[PDB]
Ligand binder design. Structure first.
Ligand code: NA
Lengths: 396, 407
């Protein structure tokens, strides 16, 4: 129960099976003392807290609240920090994810996805006898609504749904007004079970601004009509877009729905580990130099098992020789560059005669940090002296 | 070893101490929608068919195999491999060795350099088990000295294999100077490091005359060390991959395989498909074989346009290196059984996002929200690190066991 996994990678010696993650400090792991198996995933406590407090300081120019997507870390320890620093809820994608977040103390989850399949539905139904828990999922088809309605009725629960709008050539969401009206009608056939709680879209399938505005404006018109018809079962109704790349455009268009006093706008941002200019990169992967077979080629103990290829090639940022007081920063001018990532190894180009030895450590930055998280069941949190203060568990 | 109550791809797990091997008692049936989709599904009868085939193959040709476990990291599967004749399991990292040890593997060839005090300590802890045999690779004086000093300081002994490499390659000594420097360094730790043999990965090379030359060098270095009596293990181990280049390796290692001073150990990959080198290359010699044993099951979530269905399967569930998922079976809840999907149905996955996939279908397809599709993937072993728990089913789609992974 929120205990360190003694068989995971990227850890030091774990002398019991019930050592609380938050008690990791008593194990006295220090990264520089080689207490920890490399490769390891390392969050800097000072930077994580910086990024949290930075986001907390953010005063929006518009009436909008944030439900950051949790799928990139799947770490309820981080979700709780996000919620205590002002997030409205967590956006998740699967029933499995929702259960994980719920048992990690998240009390509001926007499942930005269709809920389908008997076990996925039951996994959500299991959380719905908690009167303090708030849940939403998306609907975009009559069949999907009927499946939800029949199931949740059969287990005597209520389920909040958001009508999802979509676009031609897009992903999910109703494509036109006739579909929209059929989906809305289907919901009224389960009056004691399904509860229309708002409207949702993902505007980022579109590329041009005029298309985005026109899509946002159709969502506003549908929302205002449902307000006027008193067809929402939640007060306020929720209107949600991604609002990342299109943050400004989404806010401008969605204000028109808010002006009813009956709708709250909820946006669904991504990674906090890099609203955004002052965020600091909080995660590095640390690996050993295992072999330097040629004067310009080093082999590193880091592979695709440790670092998502969709995160981008790892970039050497720090160098540390065991026995030294501290690491040193690697300057771009040194030309240390990963030119190959295999399963468990990386190829590092170095200038001939570089001061690098087998057994040295390198800390790597990665461009899209959160995408790497799913390669790590345990992520370390370190203080500025590289002492591990906490272990973060993930639920992938 | 118990079922993780918080994992994906499972049914209702009603306790925290349900043994993985007692999964059948939970009575999960895939077609009854007892299990959360997406799920990774191994077919028991196919896994067993593949193991039995490799067992029969090893008896025909006398080959010693240490199959790669790095791609599945599933000691339940490792144990079956060893029970049906594997010589040991080949692994990549100290963490993996420890997991395999914990899962009852009694011989590991770590086909990698062992570097770093915690990594070394993790291996040292296991060496207190006198029934466990371990090997790792050395390719540098610095690496040999770091191992020697560490294992001497914990009063243990370590078997190492000299790794031969090639210019522009991966690891391994490049030339005779480098080779002799590594061997000499080994001899500086006479009661700690035990030279147990010679290893290479020949498929860094692409042309055949190069591979043969490299293999020939391996045989020559081994023979030389046999004559000088530099090995501290009888027999000494000579190990090549012998998968993608199985037929060439088999020929070149002829004389080492024939002697009793040396045992040849090959390192095949995936036993969950016909697409493994040792099997593809054995066909000439052989003239029902290896079958694909894994499929990923997912729901249809939305059919928003007549030619486009959205599937609850993403890059979180299906590794890019495994290949694009291909629809293979279709099941509508309430029905007796799935149906086979042929290419002529016109279903094809055209996009895989984080948690969703795009399925092209012909307008008017026999498909509905809430149906399940089973997908084939080209390299099934390579998708295991997306799953902490993998289901095993019997022919009636009843879950008979859950397989845990150590990634
Ligand atoms: Na635990």
């Amino acid at each position: 129960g929120a205990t360190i996994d003694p068989y995971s990678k990227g850890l030091g010696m774990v002398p019991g099976t019930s050592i609380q993650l938050t008690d990791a400090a008593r194990l006295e792991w220090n990264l520089l003392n080689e207490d920890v198996s490399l490769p390891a995933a390392v969050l800097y406590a000072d930077r994580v807290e910086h990024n949290l407090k930075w986001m907390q300081a953010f005063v929006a120019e518009y009436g909008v609240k944030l439900a950051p997507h949790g799928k990139t870390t799947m770490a309820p320890q981080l979700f709780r920090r996000q919620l205590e620093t002002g997030a409205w809820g967590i956006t998740l994608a699967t029933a499995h994810q929702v259960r994980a977040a719920y048992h990690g103390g998240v009390s509001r989850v926007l499942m930005a996805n269709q809920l389908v399949g008997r076990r996925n539905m039951m996994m959500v139904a299991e959380l719905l006898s908690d009167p303090e828990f708030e849940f939403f999922c998306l609907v975009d088809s009559v069949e999907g609504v009927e499946q939800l309605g029949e199931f949740f009725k059969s287990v005597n629960k209520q389920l909040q749904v958001l009508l999802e709008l979509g676009v031609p050539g897009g992903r999910t969401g109703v494509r036109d007004a006739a579909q929209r009206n059929a989906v809305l009608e289907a919901i009224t056939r389960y009056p004691d079970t399904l509860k229309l709680a708002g409207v949702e879209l993902y505007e980022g399938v579109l590329k041009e601004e005029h298309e985005v505005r026109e899509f946002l404006q159709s969502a506003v018109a549908v929302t205002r009509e449902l307000v006027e018809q008193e067809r929402f079962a939640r007060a306020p109704a929720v209107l949600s877009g991604a609002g990342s790349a299109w943050y400004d455009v989404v806010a401008e268009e969605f204000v028109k729905a808010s002006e009813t006093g009956k709708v709250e706008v909820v946006l669904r941002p991504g990674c906090y580990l890099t609203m955004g200019e002052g965020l600091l990169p909080a995660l590095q992967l640390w690996a050993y130099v295992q072999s330097i077979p040629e004067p310009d080629r080093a082999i590193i103990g880091l592979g695709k098992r440790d670092s998502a290829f969709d995160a981008g090639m790892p970039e050497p940022a720090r160098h540390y020789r065991p026995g030294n007081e501290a690491p040193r920063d690697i300057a771009a001018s040194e030309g240390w560059e990963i030119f190959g990532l295999m399963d468990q190894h990386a190829y590092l180009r170095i200038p001939a005669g570089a001061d690098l030895k087998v057994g040295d450590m390198i800390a790597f930055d990665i461009s899209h940090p959160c995408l790497t998280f799913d390669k790590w069941r345990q992520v370390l949190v370190v203080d500025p002296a590289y002492r591990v203060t906490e272990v973060i568990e993930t639920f992938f």
